[PDB]
Design a protein around this motif. Structure first.
Motif, PDB file in Angstrom:
ATOM      1  N   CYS A   5     123.020  17.149 114.544  1.00  0.00           N
ATOM      2  CA  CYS A   5     123.166  16.571 115.701  1.00  0.00           C
ATOM      3  C   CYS A   5     123.346  17.479 116.810  1.00  0.00           C
ATOM      4  O   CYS A   5     124.581  18.322 116.803  1.00  0.00           O
ATOM      5  N   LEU A   6     122.664  17.340 118.017  1.00  0.00           N
ATOM      6  CA  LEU A   6     123.078  17.900 119.045  1.00  0.00           C
ATOM      7  C   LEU A   6     123.601  17.330 120.152  1.00  0.00           C
ATOM      8  O   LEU A   6     124.500  17.769 120.675  1.00  0.00           O
ATOM      9  N   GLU A   7     123.220  16.046 120.438  1.00  0.00           N
ATOM     10  CA  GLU A   7     123.662  15.203 121.254  1.00  0.00           C
ATOM     11  C   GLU A   7     123.902  13.978 120.809  1.00  0.00           C
ATOM     12  O   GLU A   7     123.181  13.441 119.816  1.00  0.00           O
ATOM     13  N   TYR A   8     124.879  13.035 121.338  1.00  0.00           N
ATOM     14  CA  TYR A   8     125.279  11.703 121.089  1.00  0.00           C
ATOM     15  C   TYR A   8     124.536  10.852 121.671  1.00  0.00           C
ATOM     16  O   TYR A   8     124.281  10.554 122.937  1.00  0.00           O
ATOM     17  N   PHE A   9     124.007   9.569 121.169  1.00  0.00           N
ATOM     18  CA  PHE A   9     123.672   8.110 121.917  1.00  0.00           C
ATOM     19  C   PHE A   9     124.733   8.026 122.684  1.00  0.00           C
ATOM     20  O   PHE A   9     125.722   7.457 121.773  1.00  0.00           O
ATOM     21  N   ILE A  13     124.712   0.104 119.552  1.00  0.00           N
ATOM     22  CA  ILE A  13     123.807  -0.185 118.904  1.00  0.00           C
ATOM     23  C   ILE A  13     124.276  -1.566 118.208  1.00  0.00           C
ATOM     24  O   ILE A  13     125.307  -1.275 117.560  1.00  0.00           O
ATOM     25  N   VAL A  34     125.163   9.649 111.741  1.00  0.00           N
ATOM     26  CA  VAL A  34     123.949   9.499 111.859  1.00  0.00           C
ATOM     27  C   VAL A  34     123.886   7.961 111.336  1.00  0.00           C
ATOM     28  O   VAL A  34     124.161   7.619 110.236  1.00  0.00           O
ATOM     29  N   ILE A  43     119.923   7.926 114.432  1.00  0.00           N
ATOM     30  CA  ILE A  43     120.588   8.055 115.746  1.00  0.00           C
ATOM     31  C   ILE A  43     121.942   8.589 115.648  1.00  0.00           C
ATOM     32  O   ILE A  43     122.815   8.360 114.959  1.00  0.00           O
ATOM     33  N   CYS A  44     121.969   9.820 116.316  1.00  0.00           N
ATOM     34  CA  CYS A  44     123.226  10.665 116.396  1.00  0.00           C
ATOM     35  C   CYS A  44     124.009  10.091 117.256  1.00  0.00           C
ATOM     36  O   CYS A  44     124.191   9.678 118.094  1.00  0.00           O
TER      37      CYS A  44
ATOM     38  N   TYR B   1     116.948   5.456 123.367  1.00  0.00           N
ATOM     39  CA  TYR B   1     118.117   5.960 122.545  1.00  0.00           C
ATOM     40  C   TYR B   1     118.134   7.583 123.066  1.00  0.00           C
ATOM     41  O   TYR B   1     119.330   8.234 122.558  1.00  0.00           O
ATOM     42  N   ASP B   4     117.174  13.436 122.888  1.00  0.00           N
ATOM     43  CA  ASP B   4     118.019  14.578 122.500  1.00  0.00           C
ATOM     44  C   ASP B   4     118.962  14.117 121.279  1.00  0.00           C
ATOM     45  O   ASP B   4     120.077  14.698 120.924  1.00  0.00           O
ATOM     46  N   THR B   5     118.760  12.633 120.905  1.00  0.00           N
ATOM     47  CA  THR B   5     119.873  12.180 119.908  1.00  0.00           C
ATOM     48  C   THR B   5     119.474  12.124 118.321  1.00  0.00           C
ATOM     49  O   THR B   5     119.952  11.407 117.747  1.00  0.00           O
ATOM     50  N   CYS B   6     118.136  12.693 118.304  1.00  0.00           N
ATOM     51  CA  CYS B   6     117.679  12.573 116.975  1.00  0.00           C
ATOM     52  C   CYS B   6     118.348  13.692 116.256  1.00  0.00           C
ATOM     53  O   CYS B   6     118.338  14.951 116.544  1.00  0.00           O
ATOM     54  N   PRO B   7     118.647  13.471 114.786  1.00  0.00           N
ATOM     55  CA  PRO B   7     118.831  14.664 113.942  1.00  0.00           C
ATOM     56  C   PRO B   7     117.824  15.626 114.036  1.00  0.00           C
ATOM     57  O   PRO B   7     116.693  15.301 113.785  1.00  0.00           O
TER      58      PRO B   7
END
Lengths: 63, 82
Positions: A5-9, A13, A34, A43-44, B1, B4-7
Protein backbone atom coordinates in the motif's frame (compact mmCIF):
# COMPACT_ATOMS: atom_id res chain seq x y z
CA UNK A 1 2.04 -11.46 0.61
CA UNK A 2 1.88 -10.02 -2.90
CA UNK A 3 0.76 -6.36 -2.71
CA UNK A 4 1.83 -3.21 -0.89
CA UNK A 5 0.00 0.00 0.00
CA UNK A 6 1.16 3.52 -0.82
CA UNK A 7 -1.59 5.71 0.65
CA UNK A 8 -4.49 5.17 3.04
CA UNK A 9 -8.17 5.76 2.48
CA UNK A 10 -9.09 8.78 4.60
CA UNK A 11 -12.65 8.08 5.65
CA UNK A 12 -14.87 5.53 7.30
CA UNK A 13 -15.89 2.26 5.66
CA UNK A 14 -19.18 1.04 7.18
CA UNK A 15 -18.69 -2.23 9.06
CA UNK A 16 -21.50 -3.93 7.13
CA UNK A 17 -19.61 -3.39 3.87
CA UNK A 18 -16.51 -5.22 5.14
CA UNK A 19 -16.02 -8.84 4.07
CA UNK A 20 -12.47 -9.61 5.18
CA UNK A 21 -9.05 -8.16 5.83
CA UNK A 22 -5.34 -8.86 5.79
CA UNK A 23 -2.09 -7.16 6.71
CA UNK A 24 0.45 -6.38 4.00
CA UNK A 25 3.99 -7.70 4.39
CA UNK A 26 6.51 -5.98 6.65
CA UNK A 27 8.76 -6.00 3.57
CA UNK A 28 6.49 -3.30 2.11
CA UNK A 29 7.60 0.32 2.23
CA UNK A 30 4.64 1.02 4.53
CA UNK A 31 2.51 -1.07 6.83
CA UNK A 32 -1.17 -1.35 6.06
CA UNK A 33 -4.42 -3.14 6.64
CA UNK A 34 -6.21 -4.02 3.43
CA UNK A 35 -9.98 -4.37 3.72
CA UNK A 36 -11.91 -6.31 1.11
CA UNK A 37 -15.52 -5.18 0.83
CA UNK A 38 -18.56 -7.28 -0.08
CA UNK A 39 -18.23 -5.78 -3.57
CA UNK A 40 -14.70 -7.08 -3.96
CA UNK A 41 -12.95 -3.72 -3.60
CA UNK A 42 -9.58 -3.68 -1.82
CA UNK A 43 -8.93 -0.61 0.33
CA UNK A 44 -5.58 0.31 1.84
CA UNK A 45 -6.14 1.48 5.41
CA UNK A 46 -4.09 3.15 8.15
CA UNK A 47 -2.98 0.38 10.55
CA UNK A 48 -2.51 2.97 13.31
CA UNK A 49 -6.00 4.44 13.05
CA UNK A 50 -8.20 3.28 15.92
CA UNK A 51 -11.26 2.85 13.69
CA UNK A 52 -9.28 0.53 11.41
CA UNK A 53 -7.86 -1.51 14.29
CA UNK A 54 -11.37 -1.82 15.72
CA UNK A 55 -12.81 -2.96 12.39
CA UNK A 56 -10.16 -5.70 12.20
CA UNK A 57 -11.19 -6.85 15.69
CA UNK A 58 -14.83 -6.77 14.59
CA UNK A 59 -14.08 -8.98 11.57
CA UNK A 60 -12.00 -11.32 13.73
CA UNK A 61 -14.84 -11.76 16.22
CA UNK A 62 -17.21 -12.93 13.46
CA UNK A 63 -14.71 -15.58 12.33
CA UNK B 1 -12.00 5.71 -2.01
CA UNK B 2 -9.35 7.76 -3.76
CA UNK B 3 -7.23 6.74 -6.71
CA UNK B 4 -4.06 6.01 -4.71
CA UNK B 5 -5.50 3.69 -2.03
CA UNK B 6 -5.48 0.43 -3.96
CA UNK B 7 -2.92 -2.26 -3.09
CA UNK B 8 -0.15 -2.40 -5.71
CA UNK B 9 1.44 -5.67 -6.90
CA UNK B 10 5.01 -6.38 -5.81
CA UNK B 11 7.64 -9.07 -6.33
CA UNK B 12 10.33 -10.08 -3.83
CA UNK B 13 13.94 -10.96 -4.63
CA UNK B 14 16.52 -13.18 -2.98
CA UNK B 15 17.30 -10.52 -0.36
CA UNK B 16 13.56 -10.23 0.46
CA UNK B 17 13.33 -6.61 -0.74
CA UNK B 18 9.94 -5.91 -2.30
CA UNK B 19 9.73 -4.02 -5.59
CA UNK B 20 6.60 -2.81 -7.39
CA UNK B 21 5.33 -4.40 -10.61
CA UNK B 22 5.33 -1.46 -12.99
CA UNK B 23 4.68 2.12 -11.87
CA UNK B 24 1.02 2.66 -12.79
CA UNK B 25 -2.28 0.87 -12.30
CA UNK B 26 -5.99 1.57 -12.42
CA UNK B 27 -7.43 2.27 -8.97
CA UNK B 28 -11.17 2.66 -8.36
CA UNK B 29 -11.53 3.72 -11.98
CA UNK B 30 -8.79 6.35 -11.76
CA UNK B 31 -5.08 6.38 -12.50
CA UNK B 32 -2.56 5.48 -9.79
CA UNK B 33 1.10 6.41 -10.35
CA UNK B 34 4.03 5.59 -8.09
CA UNK B 35 6.39 8.36 -7.07
CA UNK B 36 9.44 9.08 -9.24
CA UNK B 37 12.50 7.13 -8.09
CA UNK B 38 10.57 4.12 -6.79
CA UNK B 39 12.27 0.78 -7.40
CA UNK B 40 10.25 -1.36 -9.79
CA UNK B 41 10.32 -4.36 -12.10
CA UNK B 42 9.60 -3.92 -15.82
CA UNK B 43 6.82 -6.53 -15.74
CA UNK B 44 3.28 -6.22 -17.11
CA UNK B 45 0.46 -6.63 -14.58
CA UNK B 46 -1.21 -9.24 -16.76
CA UNK B 47 2.02 -11.26 -16.78
CA UNK B 48 2.33 -10.94 -12.99
CA UNK B 49 -1.24 -12.34 -12.84
CA UNK B 50 0.07 -15.53 -14.46
CA UNK B 51 3.09 -15.84 -12.18
CA UNK B 52 3.01 -18.95 -9.98
CA UNK B 53 3.56 -18.07 -6.30
CA UNK B 54 7.09 -18.78 -5.04
CA UNK B 55 8.57 -19.96 -8.33
CA UNK B 56 11.60 -17.99 -9.43
CA UNK B 57 11.22 -15.72 -12.45
CA UNK B 58 13.65 -13.29 -14.10
CA UNK B 59 12.81 -9.61 -13.67
CA UNK B 60 14.26 -6.55 -15.42
CA UNK B 61 15.14 -3.90 -12.86
CA UNK B 62 13.79 -0.40 -13.34
CA UNK B 63 12.92 2.92 -11.71
CA UNK B 64 9.67 4.79 -11.97
CA UNK B 65 9.65 7.97 -14.04
CA UNK B 66 6.32 9.68 -14.79
CA UNK B 67 4.46 6.45 -14.07
CA UNK B 68 6.66 4.16 -16.22
CA UNK B 69 9.18 1.59 -14.98
CA UNK B 70 12.24 2.70 -16.96
CA UNK B 71 14.65 -0.13 -17.62
CA UNK B 72 17.99 -0.08 -15.78
CA UNK B 73 19.44 -2.83 -18.05
CA UNK B 74 19.94 -5.31 -15.19
CA UNK B 75 18.06 -8.53 -14.37
CA UNK B 76 17.52 -10.28 -11.04
CA UNK B 77 15.59 -13.22 -9.64
CA UNK B 78 12.07 -12.33 -8.50
CA UNK B 79 9.25 -14.31 -6.90
CA UNK B 80 5.57 -13.78 -6.20
CA UNK B 81 4.32 -14.14 -2.65
CA UNK B 82 1.46 -16.18 -1.27
Amino acid sequence: GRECCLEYFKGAIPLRKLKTWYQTSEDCSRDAIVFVTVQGRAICSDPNNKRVKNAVKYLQSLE
Amino acid sequence: YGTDTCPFPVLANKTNKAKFVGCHQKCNGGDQKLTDGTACYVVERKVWDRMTPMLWYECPLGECKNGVCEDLRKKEDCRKGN
